Each structure stands twice: as structure tokens, then as C-alpha cells.
Structure 1
């Protein structure tokens, strides 16, 4: 596609995994490594995606995805992932998530840093970083067709005034794309 964002998809490293319910587990926790978790919440009927990145290797160790999970359940699942990966810190897109998730992150003692995806400018910085790392052969994800498809279908458009926009082709989703970009913002 002429308007592909991820022109370096050919350099994406593809990793085998075990599906454990809502998790795709590439590898279990290694305590000599430091991890973070990109978190795109399930604000309403959209998916929540939590991407555990090994910051020593640049590889996704685990990716959890679901939709329709309660807000509290999303936070509990994030807590469990964080704890599983050595109190991995969460890079949380807190923009427009609502008071309950924001309060729950603090109330539950989640190890997190806010990265609100609050404009097209912020989004472009996150995505361009992911795209560059990808072309450089530094991005490694679970070899799952849904993940690869969501990256393949992430495209450039232009607004009425001529500003750049990045979004899913057609009527698609970008929760996986954004979760991965949030994780890799730290790499």
C-alpha cells in the first residue's frame, strides 16, 4: 500500500508464543532483564492491549489483549503482568481513560508512567519511533496474524486542512499498534 506507515514490516522479527487465555506468552520473566508494559486501555467496547517489552533485548515477552473487560479488571490484569515481569513499569496512555482508571492505577499501587496520547503530534512521535526501530530490525513481536495485520493496515491520511493523520485502514482498530508504540517509546 502506497500510504503504509510501517514500510519496514519486512524487518519485523516474528516470535513463537503460547496462547494462555488472553495472553500471548513468548517468554517467561528473566530476572536479569528490565521490562516495561505499553498499555492501551479498553476505554469502552474497544480492545485493551498490554505489551510487555524486555528492554534489554527489545523483544515483546508477552502481549495481553481483550475487549469488554471491566475497567477494574483491566487494572488488575495490568497489575498481574507487572508483577509477573518483576514489577515492570507501565507506560500508560491515560488520555481520556476516565477518572476510575486514573484513580485505580494510583489506588492499586501500579508502577506506571503516564504517556497521554493527547494529539496527532504525540501519536506521530510514538509511531515514528516504532517505525524506525522496526526498519532497523529491533522490533520483535508475537507471530500472530491479528498483530501483523493491524500493523500492515496502519496508514497515513490527511485532514481537511492538510495535517497528517495515522490510523487503521477502513474501519479497523489500532489498539495493538498503540500498545506496541507505547512500549517501544522506552527502548
Structure 2
């Protein structure tokens, strides 16, 4: 890790085997005695959308779905299917700047969701610090997928011109997986 790495506890991250089924990485199938939620961010244009299914009873990711180039309606339909697959798991959705169509469609399609708009650096910092703390404590368990691990590894601290802290991917990288995981783990006690 570089000096400015956010996830200093990456050594305590539990790595899980999985089966790749198209856009899903499936660690385990639905356990009906457990309660699940899904962290969801939505991509515009060629950006990725990432849905992270978290078993709230074990603290482990059961399934992670990631894709780009999907229509807005297809993003919502895939989220609905994942929710239904995991017992009508509730969605923690980053609703900031998602647009009228997706907002209307979540409601119109009866998706079980709670809004968590990542509307400022302050909100992002709360989400991230919670994930990072849980990680150091050995409570975060994710699919052992190099893309996921690399995105976590490359998430770094910077400062703005006014001196405020910001967190973002190194170089010209992405953080859609990081934020999806943080949205899921925001619910974990």
C-alpha cells in the first residue's frame, strides 16, 4: 500500500471463493433464516453499476453483480431479481443524481429500498470510515476477485484546494465497487 491508502486493514479482509455466473459473482445461495440487504450504485453512460448482496447475520457478501453498458431499466430489473433471489432483500441505493427515470422505476417496480444519497464528501467519508473500521476488525468478507481487491487497494486519500479531505481511486480509476460495498456495510451492526 501507498502512504495515502484508505484501507489500511486490507490484511484483515476475509476472501471468499465464488462462482462467476455472467455478471454475478455468487459466493453462496440464499439462506432463508438470514436477512439480507443490497448496496447499489448506478452508472451513467459507460460507468459501472455494482450491486453487493450482504448477509446481515454473518457480515459476508453472498453475491456481487457488476456491469456497464446496461440500460436504466435493465439495471433496475437486475436489482429486482437479486432482491427477490435473496428473500426480498432491501436495497440501500445511492439516489444522488440518478435521474427521474430510475427514481420513478424503483417505485413503479415495487423495489424494496432505502435512499442513501452520497451527496457530499462528508457522506462519503462516513460510509467509507465505517467500511474501513469493520474491515480492520475482521468483519468484512468479499469475493476473492482481483478486480474487487484492486479497487480497494487503489482507494486513496487526497486534499482539495480548500484543505478538505477527499477519498477517490488512484490515477484514473473507478470506485463503484468500493461504494457499493460501503452502502451495504452501512447497515451492518
Q: What is the TM-score of this pair, normalised by structure 2? A: 0.99
Provide Cα deviations, 1:75-108, integer angstroms capped at 9, x if missing partner. 0000000000000000000000000000000000
Equivalent residue runs for 1:26-175 within 5 Å:
26-175=27-176
Q: Please state how far the C-alpha of 1:43 moved relative to its aligned partner.
A: 2.1
Q: Please state how far the C-alpha of 1:184 moved relative to its aligned partner.
A: 0.1
Local SS of the residue matching 1:69: coil
Provide Cα deviations, 1:111-160, integer angstroms capped at 9, x if missing partner. 00000000000000000000000000000000000000000000000000
Provide Cα deviations, 1:7-27, integer angstroms capped at 9, x if missing partner. 000000000000000000000
Q: Please state how far the C-alpha of 1:44 moved relative to its aligned partner.
A: 2.2
Q: CA RMSD in A?
A: 0.3
Q: In structure 2, how many angstroms separate the alpha carbons of the residues matched to 1:182 and 1:90?
A: 9
Q: In structure 1, how many angstroms separate the alpha carbons of the residues matched to 2:65 and 2:71?
A: 15
Give ranges in structure 1 of 5+ residues lacking alignment.
Answer: none
Q: In structure 2, how many angstroms separate the alpha carbons of the residues matched to 1:185 and 1:73?
A: 25
Q: Please state how far the C-alpha of 1:45 moved relative to its aligned partner.
A: 1.2
